């Protein structure tokens, strides 16, 4: 599914994003919108055979496991089509563990390059949360 950009803020706020490591909630909306455009079954495929899938776009090299990457590390412990559905748990859950290591939200490079460093609270904008 799409998410409209009020509807995926909300349900990121019922998970526990807002502030999350230090990232106000209008961060992981604009991650979203840049790496999928709110679309929960964008997949790109990457250079090493790793596949990146869902709204945040979370790759199969070392954080799910699809069954066609060799050497998955699976951190997240979840099969990557998890990432694929309506419901954003197992996505958010899972950008949690990414977002705690030691370069944040930098692993994402659409936030990095989009979205870090402007006015992200403009994501949140008209929201009623």
């Keep these: 599914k799409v998410y409209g950009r009020c509807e ?22 604009c991650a979203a ?18 596949t990146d899938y869902g709204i ?3 790759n199969s090299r070392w954080w799910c496991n699809d069954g066609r990457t060799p ?4 951190l997240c412990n979840i099969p990557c089509s998890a990432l694929l559905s309506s419901d954003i748990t197992a996505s958010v ?3 949690k563990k990414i977002a705690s290591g030691g ?14 460093g402007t006015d992200v609270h403009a994501w949140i904008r008209g929201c009623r949360l």
């Design 8 to 29: 995926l803020a909300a349900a990121m706020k019922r998970l526990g994003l807002d502030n999350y490591r230090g990232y106000s909630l209008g961060n992981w909306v």
């Design 71 to 74: 050497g998955s590390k699976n």
């Design 56 to 58: 945040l776009q979370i």
């Design 93 to 95: 859950n899972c950008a």
């Design 103 to 116: 370069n944040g939200m930098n692993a994402w490079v659409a936030w990095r390059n989009r979205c870090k």
């Design 33 to 50: 919108k840049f790496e999928s455009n709110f679309n929960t079954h964008a997949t790109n495929r990457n250079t090493d055979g790793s």
